[PDB]
mmCIF file of C-alpha atoms and ligand atoms in Angstrom:
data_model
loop_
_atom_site.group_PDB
_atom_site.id
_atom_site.type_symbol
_atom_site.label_atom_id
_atom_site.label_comp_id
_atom_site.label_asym_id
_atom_site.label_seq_id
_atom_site.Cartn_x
_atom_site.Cartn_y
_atom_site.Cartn_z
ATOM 1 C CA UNK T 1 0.656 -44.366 18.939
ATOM 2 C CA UNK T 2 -1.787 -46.946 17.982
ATOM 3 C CA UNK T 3 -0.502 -50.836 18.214
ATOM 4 C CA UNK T 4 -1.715 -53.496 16.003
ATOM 5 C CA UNK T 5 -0.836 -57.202 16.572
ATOM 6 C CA UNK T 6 -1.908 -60.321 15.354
ATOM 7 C CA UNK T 7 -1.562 -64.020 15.022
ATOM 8 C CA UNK T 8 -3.730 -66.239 11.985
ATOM 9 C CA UNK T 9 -3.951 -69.618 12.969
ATOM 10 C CA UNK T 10 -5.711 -72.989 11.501
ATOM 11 C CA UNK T 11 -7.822 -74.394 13.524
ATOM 12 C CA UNK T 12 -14.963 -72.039 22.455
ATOM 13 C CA UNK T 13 -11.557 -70.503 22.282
ATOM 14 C CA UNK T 14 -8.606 -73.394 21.303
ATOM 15 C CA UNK T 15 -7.038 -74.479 25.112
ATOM 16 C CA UNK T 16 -3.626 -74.201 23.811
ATOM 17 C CA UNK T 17 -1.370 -71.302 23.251
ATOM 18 C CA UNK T 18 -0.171 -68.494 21.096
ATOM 19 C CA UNK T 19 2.232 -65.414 21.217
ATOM 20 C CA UNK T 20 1.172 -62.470 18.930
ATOM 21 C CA UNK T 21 3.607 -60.829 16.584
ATOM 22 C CA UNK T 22 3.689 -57.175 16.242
ATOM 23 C CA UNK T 23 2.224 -55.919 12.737
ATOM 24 C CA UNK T 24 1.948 -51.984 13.004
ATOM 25 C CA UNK T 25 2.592 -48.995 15.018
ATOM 26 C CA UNK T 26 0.401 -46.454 13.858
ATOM 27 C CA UNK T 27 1.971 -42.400 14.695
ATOM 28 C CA UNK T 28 -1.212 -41.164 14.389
ATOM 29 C CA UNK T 29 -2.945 -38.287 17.239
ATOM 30 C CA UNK T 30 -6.329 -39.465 17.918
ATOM 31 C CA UNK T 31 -8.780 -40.544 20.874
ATOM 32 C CA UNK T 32 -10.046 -43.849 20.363
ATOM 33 C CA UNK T 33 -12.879 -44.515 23.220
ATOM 34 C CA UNK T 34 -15.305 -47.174 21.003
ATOM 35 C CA UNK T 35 -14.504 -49.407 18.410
ATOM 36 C CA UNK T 36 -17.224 -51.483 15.790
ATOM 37 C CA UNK T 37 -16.931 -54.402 13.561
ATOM 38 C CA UNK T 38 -17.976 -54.759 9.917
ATOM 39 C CA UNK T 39 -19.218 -57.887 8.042
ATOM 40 C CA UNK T 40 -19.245 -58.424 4.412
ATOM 41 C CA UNK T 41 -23.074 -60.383 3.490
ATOM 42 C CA UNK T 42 -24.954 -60.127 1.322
ATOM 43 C CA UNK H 1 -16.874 1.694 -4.414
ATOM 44 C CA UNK H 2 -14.615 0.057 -5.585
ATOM 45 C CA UNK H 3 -13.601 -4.032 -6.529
ATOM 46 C CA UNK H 4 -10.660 -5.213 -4.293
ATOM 47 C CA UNK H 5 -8.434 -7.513 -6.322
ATOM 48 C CA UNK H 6 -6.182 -5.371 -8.299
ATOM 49 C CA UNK H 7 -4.235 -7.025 -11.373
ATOM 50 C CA UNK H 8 -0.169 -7.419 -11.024
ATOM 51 C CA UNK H 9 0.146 -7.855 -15.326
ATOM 52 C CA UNK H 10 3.606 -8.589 -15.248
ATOM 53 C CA UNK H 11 5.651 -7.231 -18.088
ATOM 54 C CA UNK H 12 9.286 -9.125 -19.000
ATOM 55 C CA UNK H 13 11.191 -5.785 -19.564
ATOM 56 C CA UNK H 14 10.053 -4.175 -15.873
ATOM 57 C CA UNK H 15 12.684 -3.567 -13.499
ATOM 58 C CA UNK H 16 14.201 -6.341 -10.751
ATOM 59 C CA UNK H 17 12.036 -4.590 -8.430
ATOM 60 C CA UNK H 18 8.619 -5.274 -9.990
ATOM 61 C CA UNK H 19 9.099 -8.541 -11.517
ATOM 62 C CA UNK H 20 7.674 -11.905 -10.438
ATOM 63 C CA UNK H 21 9.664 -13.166 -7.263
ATOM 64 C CA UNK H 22 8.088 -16.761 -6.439
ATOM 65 C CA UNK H 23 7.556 -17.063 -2.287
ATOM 66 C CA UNK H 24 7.238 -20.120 -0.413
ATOM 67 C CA UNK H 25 6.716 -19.912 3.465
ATOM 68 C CA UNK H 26 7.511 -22.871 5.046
ATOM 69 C CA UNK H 27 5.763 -23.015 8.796
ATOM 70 C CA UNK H 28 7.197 -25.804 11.260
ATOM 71 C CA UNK H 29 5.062 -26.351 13.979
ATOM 72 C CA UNK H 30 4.639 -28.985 17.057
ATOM 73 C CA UNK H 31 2.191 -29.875 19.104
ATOM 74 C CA UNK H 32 1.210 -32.783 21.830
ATOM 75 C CA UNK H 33 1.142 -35.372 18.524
ATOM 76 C CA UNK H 34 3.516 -37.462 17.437
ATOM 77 C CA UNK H 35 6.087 -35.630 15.387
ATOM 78 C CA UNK H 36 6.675 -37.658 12.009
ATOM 79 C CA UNK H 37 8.489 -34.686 10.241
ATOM 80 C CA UNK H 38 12.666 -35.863 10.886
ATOM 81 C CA UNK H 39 15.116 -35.043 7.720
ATOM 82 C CA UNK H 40 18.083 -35.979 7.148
ATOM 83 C CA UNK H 41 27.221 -43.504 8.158
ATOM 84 C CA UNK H 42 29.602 -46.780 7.476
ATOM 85 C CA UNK H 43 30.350 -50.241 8.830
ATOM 86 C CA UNK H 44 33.103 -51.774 10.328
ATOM 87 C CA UNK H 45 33.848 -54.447 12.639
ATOM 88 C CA UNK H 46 36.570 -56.465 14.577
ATOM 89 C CA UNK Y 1 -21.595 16.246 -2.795
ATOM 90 C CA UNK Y 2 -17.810 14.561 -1.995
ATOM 91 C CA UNK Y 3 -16.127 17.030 0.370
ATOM 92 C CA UNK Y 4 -13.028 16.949 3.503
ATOM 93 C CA UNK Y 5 -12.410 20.180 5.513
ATOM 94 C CA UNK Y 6 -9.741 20.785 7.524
ATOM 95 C CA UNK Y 7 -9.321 22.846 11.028
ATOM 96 C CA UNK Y 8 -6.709 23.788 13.219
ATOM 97 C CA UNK Y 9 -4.969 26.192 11.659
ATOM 98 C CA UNK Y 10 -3.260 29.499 12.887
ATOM 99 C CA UNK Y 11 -0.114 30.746 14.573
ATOM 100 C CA UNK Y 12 1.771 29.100 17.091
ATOM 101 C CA UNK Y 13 5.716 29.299 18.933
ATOM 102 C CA UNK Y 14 8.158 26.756 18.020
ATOM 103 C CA UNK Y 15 7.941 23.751 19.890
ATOM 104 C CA UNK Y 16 4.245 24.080 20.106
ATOM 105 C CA UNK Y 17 1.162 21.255 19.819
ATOM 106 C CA UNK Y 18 -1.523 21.684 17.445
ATOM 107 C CA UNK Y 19 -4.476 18.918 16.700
ATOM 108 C CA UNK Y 20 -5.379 19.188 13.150
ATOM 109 C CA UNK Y 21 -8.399 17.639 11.841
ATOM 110 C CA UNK Y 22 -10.228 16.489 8.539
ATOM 111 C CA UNK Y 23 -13.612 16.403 8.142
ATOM 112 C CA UNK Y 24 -15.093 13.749 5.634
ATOM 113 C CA UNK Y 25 -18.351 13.897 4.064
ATOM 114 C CA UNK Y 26 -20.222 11.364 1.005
ATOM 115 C CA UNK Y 27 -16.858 9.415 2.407
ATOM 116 C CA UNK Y 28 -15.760 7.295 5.091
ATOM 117 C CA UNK Y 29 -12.317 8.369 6.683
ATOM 118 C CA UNK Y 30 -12.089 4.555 9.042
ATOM 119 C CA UNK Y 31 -11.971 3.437 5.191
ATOM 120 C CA UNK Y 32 -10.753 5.165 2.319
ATOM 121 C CA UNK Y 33 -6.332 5.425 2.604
ATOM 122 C CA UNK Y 34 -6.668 9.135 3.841
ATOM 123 C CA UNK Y 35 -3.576 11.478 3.785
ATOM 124 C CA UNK Y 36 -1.811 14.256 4.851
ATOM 125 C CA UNK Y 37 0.143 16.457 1.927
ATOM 126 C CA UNK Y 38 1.408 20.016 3.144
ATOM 127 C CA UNK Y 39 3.277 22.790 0.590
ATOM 128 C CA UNK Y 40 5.074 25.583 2.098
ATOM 129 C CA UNK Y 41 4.369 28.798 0.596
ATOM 130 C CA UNK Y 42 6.114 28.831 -3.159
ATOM 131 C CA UNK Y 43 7.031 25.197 -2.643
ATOM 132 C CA UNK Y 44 5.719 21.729 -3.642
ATOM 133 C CA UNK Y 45 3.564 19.393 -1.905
ATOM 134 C CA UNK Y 46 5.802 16.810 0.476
ATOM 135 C CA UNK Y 47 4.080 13.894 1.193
ATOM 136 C CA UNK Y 48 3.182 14.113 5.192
ATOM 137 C CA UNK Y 49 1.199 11.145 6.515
ATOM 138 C CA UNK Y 50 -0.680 8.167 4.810
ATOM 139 C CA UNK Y 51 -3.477 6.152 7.230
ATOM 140 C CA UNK Y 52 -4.593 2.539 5.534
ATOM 141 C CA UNK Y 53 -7.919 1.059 6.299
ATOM 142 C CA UNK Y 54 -6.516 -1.310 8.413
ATOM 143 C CA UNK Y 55 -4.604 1.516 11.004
ATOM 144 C CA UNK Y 56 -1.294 1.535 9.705
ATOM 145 C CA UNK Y 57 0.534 4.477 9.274
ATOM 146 C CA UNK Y 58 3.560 5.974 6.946
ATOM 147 C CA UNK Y 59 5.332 9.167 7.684
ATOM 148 C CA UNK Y 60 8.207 10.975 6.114
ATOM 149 C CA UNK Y 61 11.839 11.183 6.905
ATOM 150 C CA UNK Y 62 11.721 15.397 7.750
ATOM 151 C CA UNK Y 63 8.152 14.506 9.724
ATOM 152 C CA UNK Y 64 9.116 11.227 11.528
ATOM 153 C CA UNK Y 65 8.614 10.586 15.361
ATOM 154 C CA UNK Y 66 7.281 14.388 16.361
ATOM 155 C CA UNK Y 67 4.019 13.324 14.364
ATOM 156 C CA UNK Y 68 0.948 11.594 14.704
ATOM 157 C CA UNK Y 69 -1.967 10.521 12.188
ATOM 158 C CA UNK Y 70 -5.099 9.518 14.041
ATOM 159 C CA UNK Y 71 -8.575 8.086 12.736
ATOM 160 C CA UNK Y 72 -11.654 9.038 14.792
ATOM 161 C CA UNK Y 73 -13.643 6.009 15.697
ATOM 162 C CA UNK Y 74 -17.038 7.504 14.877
ATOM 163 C CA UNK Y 75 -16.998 11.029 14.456
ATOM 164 C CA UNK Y 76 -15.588 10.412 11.003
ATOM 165 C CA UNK Y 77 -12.881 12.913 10.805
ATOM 166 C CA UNK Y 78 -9.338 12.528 10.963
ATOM 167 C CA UNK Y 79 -6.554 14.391 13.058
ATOM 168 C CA UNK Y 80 -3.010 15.458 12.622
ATOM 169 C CA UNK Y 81 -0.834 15.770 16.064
ATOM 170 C CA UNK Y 82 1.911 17.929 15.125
ATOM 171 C CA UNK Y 83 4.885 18.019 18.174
ATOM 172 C CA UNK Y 84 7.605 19.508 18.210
ATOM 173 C CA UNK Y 85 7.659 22.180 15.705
ATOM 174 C CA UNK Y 86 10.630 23.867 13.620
ATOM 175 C CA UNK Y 87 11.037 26.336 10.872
ATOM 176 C CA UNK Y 88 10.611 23.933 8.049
ATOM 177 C CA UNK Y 89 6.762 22.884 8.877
ATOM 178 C CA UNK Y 90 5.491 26.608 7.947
ATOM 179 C CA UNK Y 91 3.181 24.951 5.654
ATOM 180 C CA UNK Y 92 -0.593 24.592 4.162
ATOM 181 C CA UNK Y 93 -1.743 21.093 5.229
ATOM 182 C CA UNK Y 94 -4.144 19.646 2.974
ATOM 183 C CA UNK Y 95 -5.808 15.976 3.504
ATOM 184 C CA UNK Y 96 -6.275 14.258 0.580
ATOM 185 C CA UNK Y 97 -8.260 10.546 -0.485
ATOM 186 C CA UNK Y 98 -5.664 8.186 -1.840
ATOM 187 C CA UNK Y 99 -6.709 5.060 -3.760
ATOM 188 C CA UNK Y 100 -4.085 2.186 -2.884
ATOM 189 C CA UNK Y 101 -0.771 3.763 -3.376
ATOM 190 C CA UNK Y 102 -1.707 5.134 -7.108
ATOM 191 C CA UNK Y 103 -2.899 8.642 -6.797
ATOM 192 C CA UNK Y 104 -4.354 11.087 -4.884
ATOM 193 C CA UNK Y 105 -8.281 11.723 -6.128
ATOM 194 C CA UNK Y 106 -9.835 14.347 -3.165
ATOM 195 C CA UNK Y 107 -7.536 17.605 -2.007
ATOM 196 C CA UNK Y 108 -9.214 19.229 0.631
ATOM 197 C CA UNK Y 109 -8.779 23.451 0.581
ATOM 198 C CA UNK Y 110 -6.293 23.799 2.912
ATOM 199 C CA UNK Y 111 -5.049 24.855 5.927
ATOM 200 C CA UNK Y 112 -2.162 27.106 6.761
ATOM 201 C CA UNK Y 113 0.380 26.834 9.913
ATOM 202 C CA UNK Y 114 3.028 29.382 10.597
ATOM 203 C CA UNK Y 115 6.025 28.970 13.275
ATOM 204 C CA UNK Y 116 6.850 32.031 14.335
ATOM 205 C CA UNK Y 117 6.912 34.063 17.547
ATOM 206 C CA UNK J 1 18.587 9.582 -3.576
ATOM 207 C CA UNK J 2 15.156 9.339 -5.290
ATOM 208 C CA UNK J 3 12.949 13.205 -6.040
ATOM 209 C CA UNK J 4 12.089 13.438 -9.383
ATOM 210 C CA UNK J 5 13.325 16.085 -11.328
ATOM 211 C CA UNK J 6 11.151 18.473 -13.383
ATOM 212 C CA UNK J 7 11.813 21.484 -15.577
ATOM 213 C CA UNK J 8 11.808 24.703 -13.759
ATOM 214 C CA UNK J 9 9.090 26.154 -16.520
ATOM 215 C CA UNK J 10 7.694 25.508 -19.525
ATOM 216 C CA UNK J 11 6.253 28.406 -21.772
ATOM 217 C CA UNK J 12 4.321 27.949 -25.171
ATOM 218 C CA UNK J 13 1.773 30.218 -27.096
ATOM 219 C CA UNK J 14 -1.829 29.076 -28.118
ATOM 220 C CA UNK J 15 -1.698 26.410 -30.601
ATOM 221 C CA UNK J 16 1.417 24.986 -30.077
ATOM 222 C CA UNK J 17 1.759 21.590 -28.193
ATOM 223 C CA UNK J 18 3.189 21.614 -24.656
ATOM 224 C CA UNK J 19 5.470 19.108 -23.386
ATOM 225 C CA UNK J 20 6.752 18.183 -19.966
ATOM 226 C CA UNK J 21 9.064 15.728 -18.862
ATOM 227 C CA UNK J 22 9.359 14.604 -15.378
ATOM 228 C CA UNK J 23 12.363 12.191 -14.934
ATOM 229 C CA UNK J 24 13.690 10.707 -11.638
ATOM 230 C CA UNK J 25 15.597 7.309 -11.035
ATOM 231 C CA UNK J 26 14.043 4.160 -11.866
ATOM 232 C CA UNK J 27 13.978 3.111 -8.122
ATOM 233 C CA UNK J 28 10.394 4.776 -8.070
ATOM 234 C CA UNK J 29 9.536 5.675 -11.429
ATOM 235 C CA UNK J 30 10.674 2.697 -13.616
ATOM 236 C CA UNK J 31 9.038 0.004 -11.183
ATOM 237 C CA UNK J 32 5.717 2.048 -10.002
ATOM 238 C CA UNK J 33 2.703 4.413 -11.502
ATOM 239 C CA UNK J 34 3.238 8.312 -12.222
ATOM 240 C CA UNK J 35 0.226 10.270 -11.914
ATOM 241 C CA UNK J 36 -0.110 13.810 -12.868
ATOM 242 C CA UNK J 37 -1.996 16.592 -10.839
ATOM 243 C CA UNK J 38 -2.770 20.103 -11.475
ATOM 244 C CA UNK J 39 -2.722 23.151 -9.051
ATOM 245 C CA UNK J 40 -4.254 26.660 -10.179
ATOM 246 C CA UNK J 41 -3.507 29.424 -8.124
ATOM 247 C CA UNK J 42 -4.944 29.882 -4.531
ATOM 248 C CA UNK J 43 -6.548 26.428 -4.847
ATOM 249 C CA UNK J 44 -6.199 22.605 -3.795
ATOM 250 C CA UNK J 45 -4.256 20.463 -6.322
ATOM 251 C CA UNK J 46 -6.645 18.655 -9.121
ATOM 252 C CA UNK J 47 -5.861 15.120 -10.386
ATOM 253 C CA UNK J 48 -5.385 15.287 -14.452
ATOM 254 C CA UNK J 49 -3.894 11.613 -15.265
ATOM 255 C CA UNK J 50 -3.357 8.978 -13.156
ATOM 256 C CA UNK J 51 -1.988 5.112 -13.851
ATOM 257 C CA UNK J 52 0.859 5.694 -16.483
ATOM 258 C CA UNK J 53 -2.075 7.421 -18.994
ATOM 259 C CA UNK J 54 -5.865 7.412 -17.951
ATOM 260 C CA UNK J 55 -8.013 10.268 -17.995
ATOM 261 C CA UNK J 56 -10.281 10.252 -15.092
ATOM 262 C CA UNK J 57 -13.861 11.598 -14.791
ATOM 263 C CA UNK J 58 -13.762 13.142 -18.027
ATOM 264 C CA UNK J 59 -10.974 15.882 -17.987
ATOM 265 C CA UNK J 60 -10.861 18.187 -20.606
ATOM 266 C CA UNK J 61 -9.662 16.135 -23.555
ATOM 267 C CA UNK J 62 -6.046 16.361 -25.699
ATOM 268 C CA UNK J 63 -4.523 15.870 -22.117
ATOM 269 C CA UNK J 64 -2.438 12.909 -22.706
ATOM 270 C CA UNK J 65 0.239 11.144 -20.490
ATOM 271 C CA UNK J 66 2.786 8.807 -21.395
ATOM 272 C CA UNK J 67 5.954 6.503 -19.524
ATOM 273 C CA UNK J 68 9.015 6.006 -21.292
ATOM 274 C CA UNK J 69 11.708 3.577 -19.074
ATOM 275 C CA UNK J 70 12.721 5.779 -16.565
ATOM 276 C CA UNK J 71 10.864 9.132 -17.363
ATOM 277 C CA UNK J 72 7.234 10.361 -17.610
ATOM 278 C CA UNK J 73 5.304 12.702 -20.031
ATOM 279 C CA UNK J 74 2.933 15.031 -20.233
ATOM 280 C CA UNK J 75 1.138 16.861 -23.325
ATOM 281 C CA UNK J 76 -1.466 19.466 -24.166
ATOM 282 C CA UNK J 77 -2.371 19.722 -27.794
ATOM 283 C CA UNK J 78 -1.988 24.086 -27.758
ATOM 284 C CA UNK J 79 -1.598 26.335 -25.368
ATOM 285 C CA UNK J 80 -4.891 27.780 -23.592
ATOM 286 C CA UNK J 81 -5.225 30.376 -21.367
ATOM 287 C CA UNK J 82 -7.186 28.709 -18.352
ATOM 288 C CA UNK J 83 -4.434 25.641 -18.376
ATOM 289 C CA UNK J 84 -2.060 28.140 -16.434
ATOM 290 C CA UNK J 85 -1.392 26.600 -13.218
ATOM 291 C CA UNK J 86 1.504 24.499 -11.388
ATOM 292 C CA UNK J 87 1.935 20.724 -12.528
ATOM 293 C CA UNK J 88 3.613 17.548 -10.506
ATOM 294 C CA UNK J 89 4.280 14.022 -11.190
ATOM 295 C CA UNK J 90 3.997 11.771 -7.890
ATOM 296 C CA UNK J 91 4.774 8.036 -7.613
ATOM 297 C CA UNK J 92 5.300 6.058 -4.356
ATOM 298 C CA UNK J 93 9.228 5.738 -3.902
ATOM 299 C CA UNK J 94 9.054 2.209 -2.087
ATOM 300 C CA UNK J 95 12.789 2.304 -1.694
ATOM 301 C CA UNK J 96 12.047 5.822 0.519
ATOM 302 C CA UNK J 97 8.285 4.271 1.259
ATOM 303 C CA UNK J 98 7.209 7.455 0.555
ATOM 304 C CA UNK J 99 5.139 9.450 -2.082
ATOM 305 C CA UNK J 100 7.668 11.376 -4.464
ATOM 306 C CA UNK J 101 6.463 14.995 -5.921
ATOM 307 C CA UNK J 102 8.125 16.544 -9.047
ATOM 308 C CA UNK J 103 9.700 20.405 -8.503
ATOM 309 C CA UNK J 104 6.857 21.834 -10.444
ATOM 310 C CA UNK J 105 6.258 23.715 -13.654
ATOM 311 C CA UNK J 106 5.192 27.530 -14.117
ATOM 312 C CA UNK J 107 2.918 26.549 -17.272
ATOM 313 C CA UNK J 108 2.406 30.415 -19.001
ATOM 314 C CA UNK J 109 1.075 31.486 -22.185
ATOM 315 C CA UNK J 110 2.962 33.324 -24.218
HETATM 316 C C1 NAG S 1 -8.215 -36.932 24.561
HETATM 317 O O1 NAG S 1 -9.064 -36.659 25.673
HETATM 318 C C2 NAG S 1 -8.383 -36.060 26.771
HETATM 319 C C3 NAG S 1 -9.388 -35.785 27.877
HETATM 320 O O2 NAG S 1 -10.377 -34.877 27.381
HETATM 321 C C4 NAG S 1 -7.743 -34.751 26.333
HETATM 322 O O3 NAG S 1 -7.033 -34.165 27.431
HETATM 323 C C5 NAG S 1 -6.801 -34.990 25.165
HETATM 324 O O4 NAG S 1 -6.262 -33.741 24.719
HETATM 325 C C6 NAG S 1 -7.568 -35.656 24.035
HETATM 326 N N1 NAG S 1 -6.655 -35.977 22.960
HETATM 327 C C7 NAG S 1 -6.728 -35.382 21.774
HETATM 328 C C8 NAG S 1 -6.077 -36.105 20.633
HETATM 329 O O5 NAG S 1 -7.284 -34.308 21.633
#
């Protein structure tokens, strides 16, 4: 089961504090072992 | 030699025995996943 | 030339074991849906045996269990184990070339068996 | 209970149309094919029609074969000499799982 959470904020990471919500729980039968970002330029 | 698919061309006035009986195999099957597959009641209080 | 000839025939005792065989040529017995007919003398042909490409086999009520259809794996001929004879398999064996389920296209010439002491 | 059932003998004389009927229930012969095959004496049996009413591999001609409901049909415009033989109708009794052979015809010219 993959396990997404998540917290958007407005706003070196911020000193104070912040609990993250539960969004999804994925039932899905995969390995996950490396992960990669995307962008969105130009 | 000789071309494998042969041709059922069903007729309306054959018998019970030759005429078009519609099949659906349904296969349930589990392995080491996450089974998502579940099919399927009132309130009261005090 | 298209041809099947078939051995194995003579007399034998009740209760006996014969091996009787069909020999394809032009054709391909581990193929073709061979089978075994037989007609007893002044009688009509009685479906025996029927052997599908893929091994499977069909026998008659009168001819069930005792029997045995068998498809050489390169010699290409065919064999018939009788067991377990009575007076009702006096007979002339024939093989014969079946397309699907349809009809019967190649009759070998025949091969007689007699039960008798 | 499923053998079809054919007429002990049929007799015509040259020129005359022959007819045979071969009629059995329709657990094997109203749902599958008949085919018709031909045995002159001493020899092997010879297909003559197959599938309902072909003609294979170029038979002598006027031999026709027909299916009506639960019955099957043979006919040879006159009769000749050299068609003398035994004939059977055969179709695969699914209900027996079993190929199903007619009693058989004397065919003789009168
Ligand atoms: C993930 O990898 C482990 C170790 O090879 C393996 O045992 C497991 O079956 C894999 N999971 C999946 C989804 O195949």
């Amino acid at each position: 089961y993959f396990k997404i959470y998540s917290k958007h904020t407005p706003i070196d990471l911020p000193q104070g504090f912040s609990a993250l919500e539960p969004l999804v729980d994925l039932p899905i039968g995969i390995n996950i072992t490396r992960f990669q970002t995307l962008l969105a330029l130009h | 030699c000789y071309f494998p698919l042969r041709s059922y061309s069903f007729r309306p006035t054959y018998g019970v025995g030759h005429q078009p009986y519609r099949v659906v195999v349904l296969s349930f099957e589990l392995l080491h996943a996450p089974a998502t597959v579940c099919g399927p009641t009132n309130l009261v209080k005090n | 030339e298209v041809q099947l000839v078939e051995s194995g025939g003579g007399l034998v005792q009740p209760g006996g074991s014969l091996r009787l065989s069909c020999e394809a040529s032009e054709i391909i017995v581990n193929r073709n849906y061979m089978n075994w007919v037989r007609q007893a003398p002044g009688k009509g042909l009685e479906w025996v045996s029927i052997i599908y490409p893929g091994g499977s086999t069909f026998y008659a009520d009168s001819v069930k269990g005792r029997f045995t259809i068998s498809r050489d794996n390169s010699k290409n001929t065919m064999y018939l184990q009788m067991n377990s004879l009575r007076a009702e398999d006096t007979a002339v064996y024939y093989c014969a070339r079946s397309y699907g389920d349809f009809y019967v296209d190649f009759w070998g010439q025949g091969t007689l068996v007699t039960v008798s002491s | 209970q499923s053998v079809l059932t054919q007429p002990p003998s049929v007799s015509a004389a040259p020129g005359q149309k022959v007819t045979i009927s071969c009629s059995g229930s329709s657990s094997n012969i109203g749902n599958n094919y008949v085919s018709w095959y031909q045995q002159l004496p001493g020899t092997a049996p010879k297909l003559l029609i197959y599938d309902n009413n072909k003609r294979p591999s170029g038979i002598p001609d006027r031999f026709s074969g027909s299916k009506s409901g639960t019955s099957a049909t043979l006919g040879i415009t006159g009769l000749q000499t050299g068609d003398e033989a035994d004939y059977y109708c055969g179709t695969w009794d699914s209900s027996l799982s079993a190929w199903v052979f007619g009693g058989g015809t004397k065919l003789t010219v009168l």
